[PDB]
Amino acid sequence: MSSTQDRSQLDPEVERHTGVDVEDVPSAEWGWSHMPIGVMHIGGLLSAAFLLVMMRGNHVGHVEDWFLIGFAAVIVALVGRNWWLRRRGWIR
Amino acid sequence: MHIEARLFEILTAFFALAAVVYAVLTAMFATGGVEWAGTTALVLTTGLTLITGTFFRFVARRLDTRPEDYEDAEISDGAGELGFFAPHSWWPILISLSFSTAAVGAALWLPWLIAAGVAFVITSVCGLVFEYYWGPEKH
Amino acid sequence: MSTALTHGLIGGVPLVLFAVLALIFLTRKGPHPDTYKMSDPWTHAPILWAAEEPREHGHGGHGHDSHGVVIGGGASGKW
Amino acid sequence: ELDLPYGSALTSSGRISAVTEPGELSVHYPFPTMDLVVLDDALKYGSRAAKARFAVYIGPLGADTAATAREILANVPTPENAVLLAVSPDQRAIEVVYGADVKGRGIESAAPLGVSAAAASFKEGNLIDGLISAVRVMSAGVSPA
Amino acid sequence: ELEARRPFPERMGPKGNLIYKLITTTDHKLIGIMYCVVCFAFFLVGGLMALFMRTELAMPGLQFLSNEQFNQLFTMHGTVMLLFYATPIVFGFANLVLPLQIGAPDVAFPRLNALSFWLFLFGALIAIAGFITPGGAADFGWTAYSPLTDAIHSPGAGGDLWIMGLAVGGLGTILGGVNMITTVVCMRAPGMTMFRMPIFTWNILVTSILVLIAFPILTAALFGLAADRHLGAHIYDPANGGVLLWQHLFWFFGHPEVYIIALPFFGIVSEIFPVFSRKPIFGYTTLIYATLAIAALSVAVWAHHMYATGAVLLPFFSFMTFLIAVPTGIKFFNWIGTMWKGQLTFETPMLFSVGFLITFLLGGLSGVLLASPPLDFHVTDSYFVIAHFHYVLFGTIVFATYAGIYFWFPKMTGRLLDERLGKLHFWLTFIGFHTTFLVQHWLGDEGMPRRYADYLPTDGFTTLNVISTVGAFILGVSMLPFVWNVFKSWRYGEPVTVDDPWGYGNSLEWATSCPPPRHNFTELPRIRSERPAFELHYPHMVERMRAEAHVG
Amino acid sequence: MTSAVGTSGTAITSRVHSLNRPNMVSVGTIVWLSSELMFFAGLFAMYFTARAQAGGAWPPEPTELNLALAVPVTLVLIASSFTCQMGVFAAERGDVFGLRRWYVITFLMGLFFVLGQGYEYIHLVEHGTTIPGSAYGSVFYLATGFHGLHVIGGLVAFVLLLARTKMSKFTPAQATAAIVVSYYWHFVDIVWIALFATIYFVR
Amino acid sequence: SLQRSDREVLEHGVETGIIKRLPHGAYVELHQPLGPVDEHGHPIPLEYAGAPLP
Ligand code: HEA
Ligand code: HEA
Ligand SMILES: CCCCCCCC/C=C\CCCCCCCC(=O)OC[C@H](COP(=O)(O)OCCN)OC(=O)CCCCCCCCCCCCCCC
Numbered sequence A: 001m002s003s004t005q006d007r008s009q010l011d012p013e014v015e016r017h018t019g020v021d022v023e024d025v026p027s028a029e030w031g032w033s034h035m036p037i038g039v040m041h042i043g044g045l046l047s048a049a050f051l052l053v054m055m056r057g058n059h060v061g062h063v064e065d066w067f068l069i070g071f072a073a074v075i076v077a078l079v080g081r082n083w084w085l086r087r088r089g090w091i092r
Numbered sequence B: 001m002h003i004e005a006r007l008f009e010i011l012t013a014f015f016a017l018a019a020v021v022y023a024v025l026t027a028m029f030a031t032g033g034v035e036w037a038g039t040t041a042l043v044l045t046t047g048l049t050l051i052t053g054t055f056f057r058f059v060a061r062r063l064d065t066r067p068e069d070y071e072d073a074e075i076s077d078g079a080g081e082l083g084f085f086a087p088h089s090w091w092p093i094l095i096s097l098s099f100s101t102a103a104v105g106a107a108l109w110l111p112w113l114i115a116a117g118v119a120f121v122i123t124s125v126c127g128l129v130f131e132y133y134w135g136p137e138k139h
Numbered sequence C: 001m002s003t004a005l006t007h008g009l010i011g012g013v014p015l016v017l018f019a020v021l022a023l024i025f026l027t028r029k030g031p032h033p034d035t036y037k038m039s040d041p042w043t044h045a046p047i048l049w050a051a052e053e054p055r056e057h058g059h060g061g062h063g064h065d066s067h068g069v070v071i072g073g074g075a076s077g078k079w
Numbered sequence D: 001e002l003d004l005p006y007g008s009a010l011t012s013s014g015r016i017s018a019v020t021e022p023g024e025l026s027v028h029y030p031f032p033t034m035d036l037v038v039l040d041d042a043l044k045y046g047s048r049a050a051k052a053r054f055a056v057y058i059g060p061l062g063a064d065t066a067a068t069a070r071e072i073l074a075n076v077p078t079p080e081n082a083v084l085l086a087v088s089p090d091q092r093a094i095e096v097v098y099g100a101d102v103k104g105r106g107i108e109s110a111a112p113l114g115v116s117a118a119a120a121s122f123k124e125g126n127l128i129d130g131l132i133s134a135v136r137v138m139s140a141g142v143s144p145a
Numbered sequence E: 001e002l003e004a005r006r007p008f009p010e011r012m013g014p015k016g017n018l019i020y021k022l023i024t025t026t027d028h029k030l031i032g033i034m035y036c037v038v039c040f041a042f043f044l045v046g047g048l049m050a051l052f053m054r055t056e057l058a059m060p061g062l063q064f065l066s067n068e069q070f071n072q073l074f075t076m077h078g079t080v081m082l083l084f085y086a087t088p089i090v091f092g093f094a095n096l097v098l099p100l101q102i103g104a105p106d107v108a109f110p111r112l113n114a115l116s117f118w119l120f121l122f123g124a125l126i127a128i129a130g131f132i133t134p135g136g137a138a139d140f141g142w143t144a145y146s147p148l149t150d151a152i153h154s155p156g157a158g159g160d161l162w163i164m165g166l167a168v169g170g171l172g173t174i175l176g177g178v179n180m181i182t183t184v185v186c187m188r189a190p191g192m193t194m195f196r197m198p199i200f201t202w203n204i205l206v207t208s209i210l211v212l213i214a215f216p217i218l219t220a221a222l223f224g225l226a227a228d229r230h231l232g233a234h235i236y237d238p239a240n241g242g243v244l245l246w247q248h249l250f251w252f253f254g255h256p257e258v259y260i261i262a263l264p265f266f267g268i269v270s271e272i273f274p275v276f277s278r279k280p281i282f283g284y285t286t287l288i289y290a291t292l293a294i295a296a297l298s299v300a301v302w303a304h305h306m307y308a309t310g311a312v313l314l315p316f317f318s319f320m321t322f323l324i325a326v327p328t329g330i331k332f333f334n335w336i337g338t339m340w341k342g343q344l345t346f347e348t349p350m351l352f353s354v355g356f357l358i359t360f361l362l363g364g365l366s367g368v369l370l371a372s373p374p375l376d377f378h379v380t381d382s383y384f385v386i387a388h389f390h391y392v393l394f395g396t397i398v399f400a401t402y403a404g405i406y407f408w409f410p411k412m413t414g415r416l417l418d419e420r421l422g423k424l425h426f427w428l429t430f431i432g433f434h435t436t437f438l439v440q441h442w443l444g445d446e447g448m449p450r451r452y453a454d455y456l457p458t459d460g461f462t463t464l465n466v467i468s469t470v471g472a473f474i475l476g477v478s479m480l481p482f483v484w485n486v487f488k489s490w491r492y493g494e495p496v497t498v499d500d501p502w503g504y505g506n507s508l509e510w511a512t513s514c515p516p517p518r519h520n521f522t523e524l525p526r527i528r529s530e531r532p533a534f535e536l537h538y539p540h541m542v543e544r545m546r547a548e549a550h551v552g
Numbered sequence F: 001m002t003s004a005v006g007t008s009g010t011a012i013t014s015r016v017h018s019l020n021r022p023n024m025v026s027v028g029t030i031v032w033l034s035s036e037l038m039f040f041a042g043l044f045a046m047y048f049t050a051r052a053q054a055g056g057a058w059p060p061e062p063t064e065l066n067l068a069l070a071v072p073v074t075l076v077l078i079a080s081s082f083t084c085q086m087g088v089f090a091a092e093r094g095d096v097f098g099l100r101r102w103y104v105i106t107f108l109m110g111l112f113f114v115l116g117q118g119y120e121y122i123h124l125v126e127h128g129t130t131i132p133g134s135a136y137g138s139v140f141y142l143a144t145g146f147h148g149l150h151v152i153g154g155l156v157a158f159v160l161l162l163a164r165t166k167m168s169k170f171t172p173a174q175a176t177a178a179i180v181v182s183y184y185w186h187f188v189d190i191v192w193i194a195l196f197a198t199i200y201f202v203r
Numbered sequence G: 001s002l003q004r005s006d007r008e009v010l011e012h013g014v015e016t017g018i019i020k021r022l023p024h025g026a027y028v029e030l031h032q033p034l035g036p037v038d039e040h041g042h043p044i045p046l047e048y049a050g051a052p053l054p
């Protein structure tokens, strides 16, 4: 009971018509709520590329290169799964 | 609440019997007399069940038959305002993290980390305990 | 004893058995009904599917009432 | 009044507690789960832009298909802003029904488009793909309120 | 006359609907699901360690594992699979179904049970963190005997991390046991008298009593060991009774620990059998009495693991071991009677239940052979014991846990697991398990004890070790079908829109919507027997339920 | 918002109507105390097995137990137990103030017990006996110091519950919290009675 | 997820102790609405206004 409902009038400014929708992000119109999927996929691929090229260096062991290969592989697998699902329409 | 108490009474009886027989058969017929490890463990698990069963028996004597203890009890008999059941709370995970910090400080002998973990544990237990009592901020 | 032989055994016998059992089981008709052929008559009971897409304002059924179907158009087709 | 033929009992409140034998399923819909999921996507987020509850009725709608389509639309939770596509493959008959809320939003023009897409798909020999195509076409036709 | 339902339910759910709940969730069902998922992840980790050990053991030489690496492997594998997969997943199943089975809205102390889950998870993480240390995890076996565990022997930080991680996990388990005893004692349906609640809740209550009896001893022993390591506290100095002190304390813990690992899944199987047999659990009162006797005797026969120490009252513990073997036989015959003369349908849950019966029977034969000190002397601390306890465990917490998952997955998901995948998974698991662990009886009978990284080519047990490796990799592949089934059936998979996806259910968790409502119930039936849901769904049967009951 | 959806006078009430049904907080704390009894059982087993293995003089020559500082601390712990019980007696009523007074004096006496135990530890270590020093020293220090950690946890519970009583209206839920804290303190003093009898009297 | 927590608080209201309904065994959280209550028990859902919710 000890509270009063708030009325917030904030200036809005893209119009949010395209991108994310309030059903997915309930505060879509209250601030930045959408990162394009393309930038996320490109960043994941670049992270995998960095991990792979990081095998290039002044280290004699190979456990390190194996961990780098595994992490790059899992990153690329996640990116591929997301991209394939979105291409097919989030199926399987 | 007779059955609950009676269960622990039966467990107490068995554990007392086991402790007594182990002590008697280990004080004699053993290479070093009473083991003092199994015997004490049996005695104090008898005490465990004794504490629980004594509390349950006191409660059962003090308590009139609940529907939960009553056969032929209709569901509507148990209807009513059940007590408070702590809703969503993030203090348990913080308590766990603080205890993990203290635990690593114990394992890795880092007295500073042990002290920090103890402080975190106290703070998080305070948060958990006071979560549903912290009055509104008065400004 | 014959490192190559037993390594191949431990690597293959699991895989071979897995493939055999997958053929045995995964190649069996499932409990899901077979797809309804267009030629065959519609035997299933009437189906109505809805989106649950738009917000319903209140959740509680009470106070929703039955104002009207208020039909706003129509269309038809014969395949 | 009668519960399911076996193993379903009316509980204290309105809700019915039903059961099935261990082997069989419950939904029993005669379509692959993948195509049911695709149609669900078409109805759920393939329609959010429409902001009009989209419904599909595969059952048989006999007699005057229009009136029974109206009656079926009455079964939709929000028939006023709702677009229902009811197809009877026994009668080879499609119908589409809307309410007073979806008026002037492009629903009328998308009516023949959705019906034509469904009919083309059905004659090509696939009910579900026709349903999904009609839902997509009508949803894209209806601008949000 | 027809309802507007969706073509297919939500698969994944709207974005960001789970993370904050997992962090903050107080509901017992979601916490039980997290228990199941995390415990299965730890099972995968421990099984990977097992496959490493087995690949090394297929060869007389040290192909890729150093002696201490292999020792850390079996140590952390045993500890992960006992204290970090099984003792948590018993409480995972508890949180999952026990509040439902007694007609309760939630657990007694929901914040306490969430704390128990998190304490467990982070204790497991810190215990596993021994591997990342340069020295590695704990070298000393799961048992962690005294003089080998002091600072002088095994001075590594992995040992200390193991000690404290087991301590934290034990605190979590103690909190869970307190919570479950309080829930069963206090929270219970208006008609659910103590003697008509399901066998699973009886088993969980007795298991929690055993948890409180045992785990505090583990905490005391581990804290004493930590004091010995970090302070030179002479607690377990062999010149004191230190070695036998630790033996007695740790086994007084662990033996009740194996029985808390077993009893909950005995309860799961006791729930499985009646529903797929279409008849009541045979000798319900007999099952509860057998569970009570099992716990009572387990608390006091701890020292049959110390037959070869030459320092225990062997006749006393052998007699108690036989006395506790008898109640397990009573329970086994109750299960068989429950299966007896019913319209048996072998879906994946009861396939796993029957597999439990088959494997656990041989495990118990091995146990009764081991109970005799004269026999244990030869077969002690050997691969015969490995085969014994792997049969009993893998039967009681892998086959039984798989049965429980395949049983309550619909009641916790609203979706049915694929049955054909269940068939494939069960048969792969059965074949692989029997191939990997059957030969180990002969392997350990002929001289080859446990905890050997390698063995001489001139020695025997080489073909049998590679047979065991074929079996272990059969199990490894067998795990893939189940993981795929769960992953593709949580979000996809045959929706179940009604209670009792496994018809002819009972035990009152099938009186509520198949995805149980928050607070588990919108309606409670007339609780009048041990099978409220069976009576509700089949009212006509109620009279029969009372007519033939006494005939036996 | 008109009056309330749940007609409860406090955001938190007793987890059960204790008049007719068991109070889950009390049951849970009793169960947990019974488990901590087994923890102290492990400690006692350590001490006793060490006792069996001494050459007839269980307190080594360097160690000599000081009853002068040992009897007063056990007496003060018994007094703190009694004052905690009167604090409970106040708690069952609406008198949050009496509960606070009794629990404050109980906290002061428990703190005095802790300081006395620390002083006795300082005297003991200064006169030889020490955890790395000897088996008796180590078992004695382990047992008594784990009990001291339990006492310090009880002091933490006392202060936390007094703060909780400050921050909200005294309700049957806070009365239950006070009762369970009293149960814990009674368990602590009982295990101390046992530890003092075994360490100092029985020896 | 925090946004969804706020939205569900607005839709349903704060949470409290549990009650077993009289006729049947229904368990309900006994929420507490923050705004006007509909003719029946459930309240009109409040619209998020960018401020913290209780
Ligand atoms: C779930 C786990 C679990 C379960 C249920 C059991 C159950 C039993 N265990 Fe188990 N045991 C372990 C886990 C388990 N154990 C582990 C993990 C070890 C590790 C040791 C180590 O590494 O240190 C171990 C070790 C272990 C040993 C030590 C061997 C050695 O190290 O030398 C012994 C006996 O010596 C034993 C005996 C028993 C007995 C008699 C039972 C019985 O309770 C159950 C089986 C017996 C039955 C009798 C059931 C069948 C009954 C019938 C068919 C009825 C009719 C038959 C007759 C009347 C004979 N166990
Ligand atoms: C629950 C308990 C449990 C379970 C299930 C198992 C399962 C298995 N155990 Fe067991 N084991 C013990 C408990 C258990 N064990 C104990 C307590 C000891 C004694 C410890 C000691 O003495 O210290 C022991 C000891 C032990 C030894 C003795 C080692 C030695 O002393 O030298 C061996 C040897 O092969 C072994 C093998 C196996 C195998 C092959 C399995 C198989 O059933 C395992 C199946 C494995 C899988 C299904 C993994 C496949 C999964 C993947 C490939 C995916 C991996 C992915 C990720 C990790 C992300 N175990
Ligand atoms: C599932 C896989 C399971 C695989 C399990 C296999 C583990 C076996 C590893 C070690 C066993 C003990 C041996 C210890 C000795 C090391 C072996 C060796 O001797 O090989 C030569 C170099 C040193 O040679 P050098 O003197 O420095 O000079 C050389 C001159 N040019 O080490 C190496 O190659 C290191 C190779 C070791 C294998 C890789 C292990 C890391 C794999 C990580 C996977 C994680 C994936 C992450 C996913 C996100």
Ligand SMILES: CCCCCCCC/C=C\CCCCCCCC(=O)OC[C@H](COP(=O)(O)OCCN)OC(=O)CCCCCCCCCCCCCCC
Binding pocket: B099, B102, B103, B106, B114, B118, E164, E167, E168, E223, E224, E226, E227, E230, E231, F121, F125, F126, F129, F130, F131, F132, F133, F141, F142, F144, F145, F146
């Ligand atoms: C787990 C803890 C770690 C492992 C378990 C330890 C349990 C111990 C419990 C209580 C004992 C405390 C009493 C302390 C006072 C006893 C007096 C004594 O022991 O003698 C002085 C010696 C020097 O002896 P000296 O070199 O020979 O020099 C002779 C000078 N002439 O100090 C010492 O080592 C004693 C210091 C011990 C400090 C322990 C701190 C405990 C707090 C831990 C917090 C919780 C962690 C959570 C983990 C999950």
